[PDB]
């Protein structure tokens, strides 16, 4: 009934949104960290190939390794440029818009939780509208609803209550007066009228919106209404704008999965950096046909498909560095070494050996 | 008077904080971008040094360039590691804690703003308590108070209303009944008692805290009380914990200002990477003596002090590269991927020279 406390059907979907928004900074940390890790993997491969080229300087395979090193080094450079120009803004914006909306929701939900008179009369009721609910640890009436921003640790980005379409649990409500409102719990936050709601001497002078514009509290003796937020469209200046802002920002995330961060499977001449290097440094001529690039590539990779690239990479990975550069009982094969700084110092040594 | 609408002295300092927390995401973008920029500058110097070494293969200056290239590559590596492990967590946590707290405040302020019965009676009153306030543009009562998360572009955030000590404007209140409450404006959000406040059939069963634990609304006919937040100490499980968390996270930011992102200025032997490489590659003796290291360095830098490091970097920057690979001096070129493609060409020719 109008002007009564809100049963769990009304506030549980808000808890679920709040708990999912809680994970957005965890996903931002995940993605920022993954971008760096994938740049670092690209850089490690560029360094392994560079070390192989320096150790084998002069051979046809060393020239292949230079092509490989250039490939992965260009990949690492582009990934850092993408972290700087694109992912940083995406992830800060999604963190900020989601955390702000979560604050708007939690302050409303926290008000309902506390605005009660008894164990059976209040603004926040259980599923059947029998008992007012209590917070117990992270749960409210058995519902995960921390009403807090949890400590931020990396968590894979997940989209359940906030998806590409919108807030999938916040549908058009068919019957708020029976599905949202209790039958007898008293709650002055359910209307702006003075008899049973927020008004003192008379009704509030207008409808009041709560939870960043989601619920509209009429100043008449009528049930609340809610925005349908499950099929959003871009807009400005809406009363529920923080909902749109967070939806727009989460939908915009690519994660660390754009081409900078992924390995290429294509033929060798189609791989980043390769053909420009062949034309300028090996063929030493422009306007060379595709057959000429493939023939020159065969000199260094035995072929021009992805399988021959992989074969060169395996040679790089099995190549050992000197035992004194990597611990004592430590691995020496390049493929068993990782870490940019560590491989950087090893490259420097072999580069100095080449200088002599 | 108790149980009445809130004059501007109550909510204005909350506007001040909300407006400043709006800046914290801008500062996170600024720092994440600055760190990546500084890494990129380190890498460019690594690449210029490496290209110089390739073109000048065999000379003592080329070996100095190898030492220089190792230095900057290590600095670039460490910066990306710091970005990943430390700066990202710092700036995501500050963005989130500030934005969350700002949402908690803005919902409460937006609720007071709307809960009114007339232009003279409501929950959000002006300075003198004569009229309820209205939001006009980005101000409420003449005070910046947008109650929005504004678009994010990089900017250093102000640290005026939330600083190292806490929230300067959220002081111990000497007289809430008269400084925070009007005497006649009606506002059911001002108490939990049933006659004038949130209670219907009787008072609420306990006090209610609002704005993430800042204001406590008694279930009796008494004035509100507020937390003093201007001298915070680290704590957990507090009713006002979101205030503590945003304060802790802002205080903890280093920026892109740690040793990974700054250039070194002392002698060559103490510079990142130098002595290990000299010992391993040139002296062929680990744990060598200062004198030995510095004698060996003199053969390539013509000295062992920062001024000779700078001199080699000038030589690196003046080295020309082929016009068709691109301004042709290495110091006139910037951009990691671009300098990478150039290093690749010269390395391919080094292989051909055999």
């Amino acid at each position: 009934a109008a002007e009564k406390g809100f049963k769990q059907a009304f506030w549980q979907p808000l808890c679920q949104v709040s708990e999912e928004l809680d994970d957005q900074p965890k996903g931002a940390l995940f993605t920022l960290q993954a971008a760096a890790s994938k740049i670092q993997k690209m850089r490690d491969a560029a360094l392994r190939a560079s070390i192989y080229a320096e150790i084998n300087h002069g051979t046809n395979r060393a020239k292949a390794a230079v092509i490989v090193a250039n490939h992965y080094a260009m990949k690492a450079d582009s990934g850092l440029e993408a972290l700087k120009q694109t992912l940083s803004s995406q992830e800060v914006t999604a963190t900020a818009t989601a955390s702000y909306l979560k604050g708007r929701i939690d302050e409303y939900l926290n008000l309902l939780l506390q605005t009660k008179e008894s164990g059976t009369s209040g603004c926040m009721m259980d599923t059947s509208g029998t008992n007012t609910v209590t917070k117990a640890g992270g749960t409210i009436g058995g519902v995960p609803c921390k009403l807090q921003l949890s400590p931020i640790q990396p968590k894979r980005p997940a989209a359940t209550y906030l998806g590409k379409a919108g807030y999938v649990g916040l549908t058009r409500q068919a019957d708020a007066a029976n599905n949202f409102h209790d039958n007898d719990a008293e709650c002055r936050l359910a209307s702006g009228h003075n008899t049973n709601g927020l008004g003192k001497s008379g009704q509030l002078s207008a409808a009041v919106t709560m939870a960043a514009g989601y619920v509209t509290v009429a100043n008449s003796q009528t049930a609340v209404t809610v925005q349908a937020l499950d099929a959003l469209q871009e807009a400005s200046g809406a009363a529920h704008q923080p909902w749109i802002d967070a939806w727009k920002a989460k939908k915009a995330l690519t994660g660390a999965e754009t081409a900078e961060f992924r390995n290429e499977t294509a033929g060798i001449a189609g791989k980043t950096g390769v053909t420009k290097l062949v034309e300028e440094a090996l063929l030493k001529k422009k306007d060379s046909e595709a057959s000429e690039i493939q023939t020159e590539l065969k000199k260094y990779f035995s072929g021009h498909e992805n399988e021959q690239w992989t074969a060169i990479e395996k040679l790089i990975s099995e190549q050992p560095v000197a035992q004194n550069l990597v611990g004592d009982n430590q691995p020496t094969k390049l493929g068993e070494l990782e870490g940019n700084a560590k491989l950087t110092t090893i490259l420097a040594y072999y580069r100095m050996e080449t200088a002599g | 008077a108790a149980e009445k609408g809130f004059k501007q002295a109550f909510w204005q300092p909350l506007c001040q904080v909300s407006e400043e927390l709006d800046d914290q995401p801008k500062g996170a973008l600024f720092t994440l971008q600055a760190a990546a920029s500084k890494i990129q500058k380190m890498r460019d110097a690594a690449l210029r040094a490496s290209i110089y070494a390739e073109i000048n293969h065999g000379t003592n200056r080329a070996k100095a360039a190898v030492i220089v290239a190792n230095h900057y590559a290590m600095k670039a590596d460490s910066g990306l590691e710091a970005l990943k492990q430390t700066l990202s967590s710092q700036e995501v946590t500050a963005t989130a804690t500030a934005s969350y707290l700002k949402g908690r405040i803005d919902e409460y302020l937006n609720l007071l703003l709307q809960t009114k019965e007339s232009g003279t009676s409501g929950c959000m009153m002006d300075t003198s308590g004569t009229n309820t306030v209205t939001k006009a543009g980005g101000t409420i009562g003449g005070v910046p108070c947008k109650l929005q998360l504004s678009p994010i572009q990089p900017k250093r955030p102000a640290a005026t209303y939330l600083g190292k000590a806490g929230y300067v404007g959220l002081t111990r209140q000497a007289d809430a009944a008269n400084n925070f409450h009007d005497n006649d404006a009606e506002c059911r959000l001002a108490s939990g008692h049933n006659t004038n406040g949130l209670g219907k059939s009787g008072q609420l069963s306990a006090a209610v805290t609002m704005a993430a634990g800042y204001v406590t609304v008694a279930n009796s006919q008494t004035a509100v009380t507020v937390q003093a937040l201007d001298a915070l100490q680290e704590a957990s499980g507090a009713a006002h914990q979101p205030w503590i968390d945003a304060w802790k996270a802002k205080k903890a930011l280093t920026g892109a200002e740690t040793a990974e992102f700054r250039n070194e200025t002392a002698g060559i032997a103490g510079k990142t990477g130098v002595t290990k490489l000299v010992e391993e590659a040139l002296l062929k003796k680990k744990d060598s003596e200062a004198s030995e290291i510095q004698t060996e360095l003199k053969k390539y830098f013509s000295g062992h002090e920062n001024e000779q490091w700078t001199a080699i970097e000038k030589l690196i920057s003046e080295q020309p590269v082929a016009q068709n690979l691109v301004p042709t001096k290495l110091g006139e070129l910037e951009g990691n991927a671009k300098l990478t493609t150039i290093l690749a060409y010269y390395r391919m020719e080094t292989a051909g020279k055999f």
Partner: nanobody
Amino acid sequence: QVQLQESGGGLVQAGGSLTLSCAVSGLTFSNYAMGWFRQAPGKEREFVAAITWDGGNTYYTDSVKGRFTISRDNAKNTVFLQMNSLKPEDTAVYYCAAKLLGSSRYELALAGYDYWGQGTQVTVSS
């Protein structure tokens, strides 16, 4: 901000042990070599021990070699100095210090570091 915080010092009998701890905050601990220095009464500050950023090498001054053992726990952002067989001459204020990517005895004994702790007193009483 960056903070290096020493603990584990105080008063100990001659021939006893101390575990000095240095916790690092605000910094990517795994990027940093860590060193221990000490200032005994009426003497210049001296190098005690250090560990490279990757933990591959450790260095000691002659007077503590074999008696002290430096080690690091990257997961706890902490470097330790295990001091055994303590002597009155070991009485000193002990400082923790951090140097980016430190990798050689010369750097870690003689060159300048990036960050310093405030020190903690160790007293070896016979």
